[PDB]
Design a protein around this ligand. Sequence first.
Ligand SMILES: [Zn+2]
Ligand SMILES: [Zn+2]
Ligand SMILES: [Zn+2]
Ligand SMILES: [Zn+2]
Ligand SMILES: [Zn+2]
Ligand SMILES: [Zn+2]
Lengths: 134, 134
Amino acid sequence: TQDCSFQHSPISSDFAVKIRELSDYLLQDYPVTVASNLQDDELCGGLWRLVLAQRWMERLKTVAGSKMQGLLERVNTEIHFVTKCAFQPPPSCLRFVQTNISRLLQETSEQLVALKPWITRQNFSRCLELQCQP
Amino acid sequence: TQDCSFQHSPISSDFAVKIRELSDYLLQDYPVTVASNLQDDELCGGLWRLVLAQRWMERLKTVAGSKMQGLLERVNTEIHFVTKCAFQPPPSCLRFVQTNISRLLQETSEQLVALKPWITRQNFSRCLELQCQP
Ligand SMILES: [Zn+2]
Ligand SMILES: [Zn+2]
Ligand SMILES: [Zn+2]
Ligand SMILES: [Zn+2]
Ligand SMILES: [Zn+2]
Ligand SMILES: [Zn+2]
């Protein structure tokens, strides 16, 4: 079974800085998406969204200018650890809804904060399969 | 009667610079619009489009990060001369279409180049009213 756990915490302490820096050069209502029906799971929840947010940082880098690429990539690095785990592609039941990139960035920050005290204490093996709610 | 002429330095020599400096920090496919059926007019064509690109620059300034505002505010200053004339509100016939902001900025640059050799020699009074193709 693919496992997923972090012995040492992957979250850096100045991640909120790299996000405020990206936001300083962003057109805040740029359309991105967020899952609208992610199952309520107090252990995998933030992790699922970080994986999704992470998938967005990559897509954004491809249509970003030389200098915006660095700000994206630098925020990408703060949450790229989620790929250390074999997360499965989103299920067909997962619905996405258009939201401002400022919303996505704000939530990502929040998820890192809430995840910080637990990232190294929990076994996240069952988070690999993203789950839906109706 | 309302007049629209420019006897000063309307278009500068360094506009492609403030623009490229803006694009380097942009998500190239950010959604904007361009008029799709602007009537054919040798004298007003570019001006009308600059008029529209200008309103976008103002708009995008209200949703931009503190530092993106500066990048914008400077590109807006390059085409700010269009607000010197009493351009009338766009006609109901004027259809708009979504386009990447990269295409808008590229076109805005091309327009300033084409308009540069003439902006201070022509009288644009008849451009105050934007027209559509039949
Ligand atoms: Zn292992
Ligand atoms: Zn160790
Ligand atoms: Zn990567
Ligand atoms: Zn200039
Ligand atoms: Zn003609
Ligand atoms: Zn003004």
